[PDB]
Amino acid sequence: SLEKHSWYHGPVSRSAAEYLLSSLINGSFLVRESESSPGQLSISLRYEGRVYHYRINTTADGKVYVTAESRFSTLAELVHHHSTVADGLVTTLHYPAPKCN
Ligand SMILES: [Cl-]
């Protein structure tokens, strides 16, 4: 299911994610699992020459969020929302990074 999204890259280290994003434009991003655990998810977001790593958090009622004030039933909805309004992030999730895979 998640791997069908162009923005979901699976397990990727912090350094590898930074490399993937390093020559891309503002708003380029990817969702990754940690390199060793599928349980730890982050969004890595290129903005103003740097890569910001946002932990994905989960609530008791099973929603996910990166901004406390905007929570969603699914990660696809979270990404879709922050693709048009930054809503707390440094910028919008505009351009899914091409997968190297
Ligand atoms: Cl960071």
Curated annotation (Swiss-Prot):
It comes from the Eukaryota. Residues 7-97 form the SH2 domain. It is found in: Cytoplasm, Cytoskeleton. Widely expressed. The modification Phosphotyrosine is found at residues 8, 19, 52, 65, 95. Phosphorylated at Tyr-95 by ABL1 in response to oxidative stress. Phosphorylated by PDGFRB. Belongs to the protein kinase superfamily. Tyr protein kinase family. ABL subfamily. Non-receptor tyrosine-protein kinase that plays an ABL1-overlapping role in key processes linked to cell growth and survival such as cytoskeleton remodeling in response to extracellular stimuli, cell motility and adhesion and receptor endocytosis. Coordinates actin remodeling through tyrosine phosphorylation of proteins controlling cytoskeleton dynamics like MYH10 (involved in movement); CTTN (involved in signaling); or TUBA1 and TUBB (microtubule subunits). Binds directly F-actin and regulates actin cytoskeletal structure through its F-actin-bundling activity. Interacts with PSMA7. Interacts with CTTN. Found in a complex with ABL1, ABL2, CRK and UNC119; leading to the inhibition of CRK phosphorylation by ABL kinases. This is Tyrosine-protein kinase ABL2. It comes from Homo sapiens. The chain holds residues 167 to 267 of 1182 of the full protein.
